[PDB]
Write a protein that binds this DNA or RNA. Structure first.
Ligand SMILES: [Zn+2]
Ligand SMILES: [Zn+2]
Ligand SMILES: [Zn+2]
Length: 84
DNA sequence: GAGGCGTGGC
DNA sequence: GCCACGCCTC
């Protein structure tokens, strides 16, 4: 698995990874936003999932030692380290 | 917090 | 391919 574009030599493990990377060279964005009047599109599926947080303000990851909640797991993981 | 992105089990 | 974990950088 290797990117065969103009000069890019980046190599990935799976083909799923390589296929996604090539979207940076083509600008293809297969993942559209179904929100009414948004029209946004993204290269990665997880990128679109985050954009839905904007419209919904959803925050599923909640700190069990606080009332705070977060949109992403890595946000909560860093907050938890603050409680030690 | 947000964006970009590398990665692995399924 | 999906999707989730999680590191990097600002
Ligand atoms: Zn490339
Ligand atoms: Zn949208
Ligand atoms: Zn907390």
């Amino acid at each position: 698995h290797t990117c065969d574009y103009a000069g890019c030599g980046k190599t990935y493990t799976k083909s799923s990874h390589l296929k996604a990377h090539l979207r940076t060279h083509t600008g293809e964005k297969p993942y559209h936003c179904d929100w009414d009047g948004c029209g946004w599109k993204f290269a990665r599926s997880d990128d679109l999932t985050r954009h839905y947080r904007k419209h919904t303000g959803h925050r599923p990851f909640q700190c069990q030692k606080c009332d705070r909640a977060f949109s992403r797991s890595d946000h909560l993981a860093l907050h938890m380290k603050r409680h030690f």
